[PDB]
User: Which sequence fits this backbone?
């Protein structure tokens, strides 16, 4: 029946760094990765900043010939994946390649490539669309290209669930392993939606912070002066592995993935209900899946995107699920520093949750200068808090009311 | 926990619902024609499978519909159809146990085109406020859950040609695991626009048989020259067996197996031996606890491509051995074209209906079977025959493979 799933490898590109340790160093130091966007002219836009990946060198991962065929979200996804596989120490062979799969997702995918090709179509005609437009832009090609590069022949797929993509990708990949469909999965997500369509689109929806004068203070979850999310880019990948498989090869085990929960709000296209009813049902599903007492939860890495309705819904949901224990645990939003990585958010935040377990420290919610009415939990304001963490949750409560919760536990 | 199919819904190039589409399938009718909605003079391919006469206001108000990309409208239509067909009554007692997994290969290309037009010509402040929510792939699942009040697992797959097949398979897993009693699963696509036809055209992936569009899709025929791009949607209501029995549901068939693999070979062209497709079919059969000899009908991937079609023949021969000549295999894409994200969903429906009616759909246009294509490919005309177990295959871009196994329920 249901086999146990552990984390043996991790990889990442974020607004804070070009790998896991550098990103984590920034997280624990309370550093913002948010800055005015330099790669395009945003003078005509209401938001002119975000979390860019800085100094990415694709030549550390892929030949120039292969890299030019790929949208940045694919480059980022492959980078995080290559890091995670290397980190795991796993040797891929004919004996195991059929048992190793991939589930790397994205919220929007190759929007830069789509936009660029639409410009070519409109101004020059259809014969100027790139032959690599489809294979270089569709969301499943992170899973596609990774499997080809490394010879991974197990289950191969891709989620697209907006803010929840990375969380679903990791959860369902653990389900594959638990079910016996695979012994190893590379899972997570990637995003690069910082183009005219992305910044303009979220801008037209009035979804983004417009705090152009102080970009590092823009992302401020649970603060009374929050005004929308900050768009960020990057990727996270984890190597998930069946427990006995990991033990048999003497793998280093970071943590155990013990629970995964899902729900739908069935409420609104963009905003959650203020009581966070769906989020609460999601966390409850996750806790039951993990066979845990709620009081066992020590740290919650929040969705916390710095939106009026979104942030307050999470407080309400945490209070409903945990009761008086809501005041004993610590919850923080690392999006205060990284901004919102959309399809990659759940992946980088799973990594942060695993590292919170490794290092026994809760990452801060920076910018929490004045908590809003009712936001009176331990939200780890301003600075990292060393504390006991035996169980960590990571929440993603995304566009369309799609909810996912992952439950991680210390392994010994 | 066993999983059964209690409702189905569809938009295809052959009809605006399941029965109309199925009638076309059994008649050998083509849904492919020159594309009318845009000027394709400068394009190498000027035809495909369009949904004709779709009326969204049978499902949604004009205001609701306006914001949503066509792929979402199509996905909602199939989903609404399937839920209605199932007879399920949604209540407070069960709403947290009913979820949605509707996917798409490429999603809102038409809305992206339109908002690009506005961005380039007049700037970012002229992008639609509803662009993002009305264009992102998970919004079929999102909108459906909101409209019907469904609070169970809510997600979306995007695995090109295999989307619909993965969506149905993984929704069945949700039910089997106990995280849901009912799932609405499938896919939708509306990519037969400028970016889609131009994009696949640039990749030289499409048939260019502009002079005879109905003859263009010709799986395993020696003169095939690429796939035909088509629009539409399919949706299935998957239900736990006891749940279905307790409410007296009509059960079309049972979903008994789901298999996956990766080729880890090429972007678009599978290995000639179909090794990945073979592993996938074997995985599906193992999941179902069935021997290859129990399979009666296979609804192929069969997109009408040189490498793709022949890999499937090789895969079927390796998996089924001598029994490969006893079963029937056909590609309904010969009539429907390739619905991309919706292909696996509409083809799961065709497989279920093959079981209901005991008839194998034809592979039309199979005038001259290519070298080695000597199986029973149901050439030209529908074939009544015994069908106890049916497979549906999807072997998609990226080498991503999925196989569903359906069985008669008595
Ligand atoms: K989180
Ligand atoms: K099929």
Assistant:
């Amino acid at each position: 029946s249901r086999r146990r799933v552990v984390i043996t490898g991790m990889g990442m590109l974020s607004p804070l760094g070009l790998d896991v340790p550098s990103s984590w160093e920034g997280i624990l130091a309370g550093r913002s990765g948010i800055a005015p966007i330099e790669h395009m002219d945003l003078s005509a836009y209401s938001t002119r900043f975000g979390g860019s990946v800085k100094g990415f060198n694709v030549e550390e991962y892929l030949s120039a010939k292969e890299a030019r065929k790929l949208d940045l979200f694919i480059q980022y996804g492959l980078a995080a994946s290559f890091q995670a596989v290397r980190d795991s120490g796993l040797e891929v062979t004919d004996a195991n390649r059929e048992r190793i799969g991939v589930s790397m997702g994205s919220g929007i995918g190759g929007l830069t490539n789509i936009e660029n090709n639409c410009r070519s179509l409109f101004e020059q005609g259809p014969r100027r669309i790139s032959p690599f437009f489809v294979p270089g832009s569709i969301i499943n090609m992170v899973s596609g290209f990774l499997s080809i590069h490394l010879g991974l022949q197990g289950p191969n797929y891709a989620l697209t669930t907006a803010c929840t993509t990375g969380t679903h990708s990791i959860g369902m990949a653990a389900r594959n392993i638990a079910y016996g469909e695979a012994d190893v999965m590379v899972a997570g997500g990637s995003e690069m939606a910082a183009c005219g369509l992305g910044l303009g689109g979220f801008g037209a929806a009035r979804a983004l912070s417009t705090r152009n004068d102080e970009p590092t203070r823009a992302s401020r979850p649970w603060d009374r002066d929050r005004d929308g999310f900050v768009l960020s880019d990057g990727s996270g990948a984890l190597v998930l592995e069946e427990l006995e498989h990991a033990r048999a090869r003497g793998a280093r085990i970071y943590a155990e993935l013990v629970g995964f929960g899902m729900s739908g709000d069935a409420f609104h296209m963009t905003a959650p209900p203020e009581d966070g009813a769906g989020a609460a049902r999601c966390m409850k599903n996750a806790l039951r899946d993990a066979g845990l007492d709620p009081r066992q939860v020590d740290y919650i890495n929040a969705h916390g995107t710095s939106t009026p309705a979104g942030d307050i819904a999470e407080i309400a949901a945490v209070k409903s699920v945990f009761g008086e224990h809501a005041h004993a645990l610590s919850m923080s939003s690392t999006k205060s520093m990284t901004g919102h990585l959309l399809g990659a958010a759940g992946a980088v935040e799973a990594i942060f949750s695993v590292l919170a377990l490794r290092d026994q420290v809760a990452p801060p919610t920076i910018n929490l200068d004045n908590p809003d009415e009712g936001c009176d939990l331990d939200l780890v304001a301003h600075e990292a808090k060393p504390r006991k963490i035996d169980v960590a949750l990571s929440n993603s409560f995304g566009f369309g009311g799609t909810n996912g919760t992952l439950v991680f536990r210390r392994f010994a």
Chain A has twelve helices and 14 strands. The pocket of potassium ion (ligand 2) is lined by residues B 299-301, 347, 392-394 (CB under 6 Å).
